[PDB]
Design brief:
alpha/beta, four-stranded mixed sheet, 10 helices, binds the ligand CC(=O)[C@@H](O)[C@H](CO)N[C@@H](Cc1ccc(O)cc1)C(=O)O, TyIsonSynPvcA, PvcA, L-tyrosine/L-tryptophan isonitrile synthase family protein, Isocyanide_synthase_DIT1, transferase
């Protein structure tokens, strides 16, 4: 039949994605059955675009703001690790074109303002970080990548200002009760490990140790509640889009987690790390670990960009 050509194209795309999959690493996991499951979830969503001879569109909520802990990152502004990551995502769409002529697009849905309050990061800085990321997309020629922000939705408040109000509106319309978020979080080991990870990152950036513990635990549920709301919003806007994610994700999930630079931490993202050249390969690592390595900082455009070891 005529499906063999279509089924060939979709499977080449899925196989390329699988090369970059972000997942909880555990050697007791059968990887072969995991991939078999992912095939059953994503191949239909992929073929929807191929049948209609439409470019494959991907959603990725990512790059909200730079982490404020200087022990983790180099500067408030986006750095090489962000640049490498954008360059990678764009070139990922570019090669789909050789297999498929329409090619693909990735909408980066920057979640910066949605949880800005809970990160204790100025909306002014988040807006600045977003602006620079659009500027990096032009610097690099990332013609397949585009940006979606809370400001963009017509339904949520018109104004960029009163982001607080935008946050309130998003939570009322698209959020879920924190108790539901916590209850759901505590069924899976998927949800368990998300909760742990998000608390850890919130703790680290915040350095009265107990008040600091219980607070990170409470803010974590908050930040997850906001981010799932954001996803709900995206889930309505771009329903047939393939859902990329910056977090590990179970194989049955609709979301597909993805890496953008080499790293040994499944939870690391370039806005929580720096770029290190070791043995001719750039890697994503926390700022402090590189300093222990003794690698020397390299500054481009004046602002520090990366560390070379
Ligand atoms: C479920 C989530 O919403 C998070 O996982 C989130 C996704 O965007 N990434 C971060 C959160 C974070 C980001 C910027 C910052 O300055 C501080 C914290 C994380 O993993 O901890």
């Amino acid at each position: 039949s005529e499906n063999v050509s279509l089924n060939n194209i979709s499977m080449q795309i899925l196989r390329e994605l699988l090369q970059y999959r972000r997942h909880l690493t555990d050697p007791v996991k059968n990887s072969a059955k995991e991939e078999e499951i992912i095939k059953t979830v994503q191949l239909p969503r992929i073929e929807y675009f191929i049948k209609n001879k439409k470019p494959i569109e991907f959603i990725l909520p990512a790059f909200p703001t730079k982490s404020p802990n200087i022990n983790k990152v180099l500067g408030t502004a986006p750095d090489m690790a962000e640049r490498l990551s954008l360059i990678f995502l764009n070139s990922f769409c570019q090669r789909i074109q050789l297999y498929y002529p329409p090619g693909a697009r990735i909408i980066i849905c920057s979640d910066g303002h949605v949880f800005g309050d809970l990160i204790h990061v100025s909306d002014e800085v988040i807006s600045q970080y977003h602006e620079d990321i659009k500027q990096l997309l032009h610097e690099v020629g990332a013609i397949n990548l585009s940006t979606f922000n809370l400001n963009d939705d017509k339904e949520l408040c018109e104004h960029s200002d009163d982001f607080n109000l935008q946050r309130q509106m998003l939570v009322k319309h698209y959020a879920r009760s924190e108790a539901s978020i916590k209850d759901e979080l505590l069924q899976n080991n998927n949800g368990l490990q998300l909760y742990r990870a998000v608390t850890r990152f919130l703790y680290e950036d915040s350095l009265s140790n107990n008040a600091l513990q219980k607070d990170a635990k409470q803010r974590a549920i908050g930040v997850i509640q906001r981010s799932w709301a954001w996803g709900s919003l995206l889930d309505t806007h771009f329903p047939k889009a393939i859902r990329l994610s910056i977090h590990p994700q179970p194989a049955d999930s609709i979301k597909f987690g993805i890496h953008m630079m080499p790293t040994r931490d499944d939870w690391l993202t370039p806005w929580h790390g720096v770029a290190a050249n070791v043995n001719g390969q750039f890697i994503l690592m926390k700022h402090k670990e590189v300093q222990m390595m003794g690698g020397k900082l390299v500054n481009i455009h004046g602002k520090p960009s990366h560390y070379v070891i």
